[PDB]
C-alpha cells in the first residue's frame, strides 16, 4: 500500500513528452505529470510543459511556482473530467546523453519523494546516432530514489484510442511558450536610440519568431491535418470493408 | 548514387512513435512527404523529409497465402495520396534487432515498384523501427534507422536529420537555399488565404494566425480520431469472428 | 564589472601614431562611457586618440594652462591618456605615470568631463628580437581603484566574430551631441530597405573624406617640420649667444 | 631576399585588416619595390577569402593594381609578397605557411611573407599582444629582418585600401543574398531578408562606422594640432 509498484502512462502522453523532448538537441526541456494513484500503480494522464530560462547543464529545476500552477490546473482537472487528478511525477530530456540519471537528477527525485514518497521520474533521452550505422535510439527511464542510489520502476505504456483534447492543446502551448521568452528578451531592448540596433534587433527578433514557427508551429499544423485527412482515409477503407465482411 | 538526407519534425516523428507503442503487436505502414533537390559547392543533394505516417494492415494488401502486394488493394486503399508516399515503415516489439529480413525487401521492392512508377526507385524509404525493454520494464529503449535500395542492388542505411530548435537541415550559412524548382502545402495555404504572404510583424502575425488555426483544428482531430476507433473496432471483430469460424472448419 | 571596448580601426590608427613616431610618444584617449542593467556594468569605448608632446605641457608637474590651451573643446570627451615606449617590453606602471595619470584624472574631471574612477591609463611598447624579424606589440589598460593601487582592466577589441554587446544576441539599451555617422541616419529620413540605404550613403560619404584627410595630413605635417626646424635652429643660435 | 622595409600607413592596413575579424584567418597582398636586396613594401591589397585554415583571379586583380601604380607613382610597383593572419594563434608559421610560401618563391624569388597574430588576451592580467613575423621558406620558417619606415601621412591608396574591406563584405553578403533570391517558402523569405538586414547592419556597425568615425575625428584631431602648431611657430618667429 501507499509504494509505487507501476507506472502506467498513456500513449498520447507519451506523445507530448517525446515531442517536447525533440524540440531541441542544446538544452533539457522539462515538464510535469498528472494522474491518479491507485494501489501501487501511478496511471498518468495529463502532462504540463512548463518554461525554463535556466541553459545549466545539469541544473534542471521546476520552480515552487511552477508546482503550484500545476496542482491548481490539476483541481481544474478533477471538475472537468470528473476524475481524481493529482501532480505524480516530472519529466525531463537527456539530449545528446544516456537516459541514466545524473547525480543531480537522483538528489532531485529524492527531494521530490520526501513530499510525495509515490513521485515519479521520467527521462527521455534524444538525438542519439551512430555515425556508420546510421540508427537513432531513444530511451525512456521510469526511476526512483532509494538509499542515494537511482532505482528503476516497472513502466508499461497504455494504449489509447485517441489523442486526448487536452494532450493536444498541450503540444500547442509549447511554441506559446517559446515564443513568449522571445517577447521577453526583445523586452529589455525596447526602445534604443541607436538606429542600428534597432534594426538590428528587430531582425534578430523575426528571425527567432520565424524559427519557432519553421521548427515547432508549421510541423504541428500540418500533422494535425494530416491526421485528420489520413483518418478519413483510414474510416472509408474500414467502412468498405466492413459491409463486405458483414456477410461471411 | 548521390548524396542522400532524410529529414524529420519532432510532430512527425512523435506522431510515429505515437501510432507505434498503440499497436497490440506489430505494425507496418506508409511514409507521406516530399523529395527536394540542391546544388552545393558541385554536386546535388537529395533531400527527402517526412510530412506525415499512416498506418495499414499488411493482410489488407495481399493476394491470400502469399506475401504479394494486391497492386488493385494497394491502390484502392491509398486512393489519391500515392503521390505523397515517399515510402514505408515497420515497427516490430520485443527486440532489439534493426535488420532488415527477406519478408521485407520484399516488400520494399513492390512498394518501391509501385510506388516508384508514379517518387524515383534509387530513394524509395524503408524505415525500421523497433521497441523493447529491460528486465523490471523501467527502462523502454526505441531503435528506427532509414534504408533505402541502392542501383548496385544493395540496402544501405541513410542519415536522418530531426529538425529542431538547436539544428536543422538548411544549414549547410544561416540562409536558407533555395531548391532545385519542380511543378507540384497545408501551411502556406492558411497563409496565402490570410492574405499573410505579402518582416518582424508579418512574422508575428503568421505565428498567431498559425496558433489560432492550430486551435481550431483540436476538435476535428478528436471527432476523426473517435470515428476511426470505433471502425477500427468493429472491423477487427468480425475479422476474429471470421477467422474462428475457418478455423472450425478446419 | 568595467570594460575598455574598442574598433580595429581606432586601434589600428593608434598604432600607426605609435610606430611612426621618432622616439617615444605621449596623447590622450577620446571616447565615451556608457551603463548597461544586467548589475551595473561599465563600458568604456574610445573612439580616437590624439598625440601630444609631453614637454609642451610642462612648466613632472602638469602645466593645466598650457593643457587646456592644447585639447581645447575636446576635453569634454577625454577619457584618459596613452604612453608608447619603443625599447623594453614590460607593461609596468612607473612613478612619472602614476603622477601623470592623477593630474590628467583630476583635470578632465568634471560635471561635463568624465568620471574620475574611470580615467584610463593605456600602456604601449613595441620590442624586437635579434634579427629583427619578429616585432611584437603588446599593450594594458588601467585605472585608479579605491584602496590606492592600479589594476588592469579588460580590453574588447570589437569585430565582426564578437564584440561587447553580445552579453543573447540582443542590443540592450544605455541608460540615458550627434556624431557625423548619426546626423547621416537623420539625413536620410527613414528593415531591409533602411540597413542598403545606410550602407549606400555611408559609402560615398565615406569616399569623399579621403581626400579631406590627406589635406589635413599634409598641413600637419609641414607645420610639425617647420616648428621643428625652427626650435633647432633657435637652439643652435641661443647656445652660441 | 635580404631585408624587408614596411611602410607604417600599409601596416596600418594590414594590422586593420587583421582586426576586423576574430574567428577567421584574414589575407592579401604586399606591393611595393624591390632593390639591393631590401623589399620597399608601399601598397597592400585586400583580399577576400574558404572557411577552413587554408587564388588566379586574386593575383590577376593585384597584377594589375601594380601596374596602375607604376603609372601613377612613376615607380616600378608589383606584388612583393603576401599577409595573412593569426588570430588565437602564435605568429609562428605553421606547415601549410611555409608550404605556401615556398611554392611562391619559385615563380618569384625573393618573396615575402608577413603574419599578424592577434587576439590574444592574458587572463587575469588584461594585457594583449600582437606579433608581426617576416618569414620565408628553405627547407621550415626562416626570419628575415624587418623595418617598419616612417611615414609623415597616410597613403591615398592606403586609405581607399582601408574602404575596401567594407565593400568586400557587403558585396559577399549580396552574392549569398542573391544565390537564394526568390524563395517559394514565405518562412524562408522572411528568413533570409532578417539574415541579410542583420549582416548589413552588422558590417557598418564594425567596419563602416568605426572607419568613418575615424576619418572624420582624424581631421578634427589634425586641425587641433595644427592650431597649437601654428601659434607656436608664431612665437618661435617672434624670436
Ligand atoms: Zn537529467
Ligand atoms: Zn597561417
Sequence with gaps: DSSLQKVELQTDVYMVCLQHALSTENFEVMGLLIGNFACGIAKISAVIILRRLDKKKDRVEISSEQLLKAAAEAERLTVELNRPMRVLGWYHSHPHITVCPSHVDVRTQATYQTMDHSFVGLIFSVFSEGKESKEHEIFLNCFQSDNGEATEIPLEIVHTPDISDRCLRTMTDLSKILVQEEEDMAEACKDHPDVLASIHNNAVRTRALIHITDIITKPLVQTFEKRIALNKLRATHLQRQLQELQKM | ?250
Design chain 2, 1 to 250: 548514387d548521390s548524396d542522400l538526407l532524410v529529414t524529420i519534425s519532432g510532430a512527425a516523428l512523435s506522431l510515429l512513435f505515437f501510432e507505434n507503442v498503440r499497436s497490440v503487436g506489430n505494425q507496418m505502414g506508409f511514409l507521406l512527404g516530399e523529395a527536394l533537390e540542391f546544388i552545393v559547392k558541385e554536386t546535388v543533394k537529395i533531400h527527402i523529409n517526412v510530412e506525415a505516417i499512416v498506418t495499414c494492415p499488411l493482410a489488407d494488401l495481399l493476394h491470400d497465402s502469399t506475401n504479394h502486394i494486391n497492386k488493385e488493394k494497394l491502390k484502392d486503399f491509398v486512393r489519391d495520396k500515392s503521390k505523397q508516399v515517399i515510402g514505408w515503415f515497420c515497427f516490430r516489439r520485443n527486440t532489439t534487432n534493426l535488420t532488415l529480413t527477406l519478408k521485407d525487401k520484399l516488400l520494399h521492392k513492390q512498394f518501391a515498384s509501385h510506388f516508384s512508377g508514379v517518387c524515383k526507385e534509387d530513394f524509395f524509404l524503408t524505415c525500421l523501427l523497433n521497441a523493447s525493454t529491460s528486465e523490471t520494464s523501467g527502462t523502454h529503449k526505441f531503435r528506427h534507422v532509414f534504408l533505402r535500395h541502392n542501383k548496385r542492388g544493395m540496402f544501405e542505411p541513410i542519415s536522418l536529420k530531426i529538425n529542431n530548435l538547436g539544428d536543422d537541415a538548411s544549414r549547410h550559412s544561416d540562409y536558407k537555399p533555395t531548391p532545385v524548382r519542380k511543378s507540384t502545402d497545408s501551411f502556406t495555404k492558411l497563409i496565402e488565404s490570410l492574405n499573410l504572404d505579402v518582416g518582424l510583424d508579418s512574422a508575428m502575425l503568421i505565428q498567431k494566425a498559425a496558433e489560432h488555426h492550430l486551435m481550431s483544428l483540436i476538435p476535428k482531430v478528436c471527432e476523426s480520431d473517435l470515428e476511426v476507433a470505433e471502425l477500427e473496432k468493429q472491423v477487427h471483430e468480425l475479422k476474429i469472428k471470421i477467422a474462428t469460424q475457418q478455423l472450425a472448419k478446419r
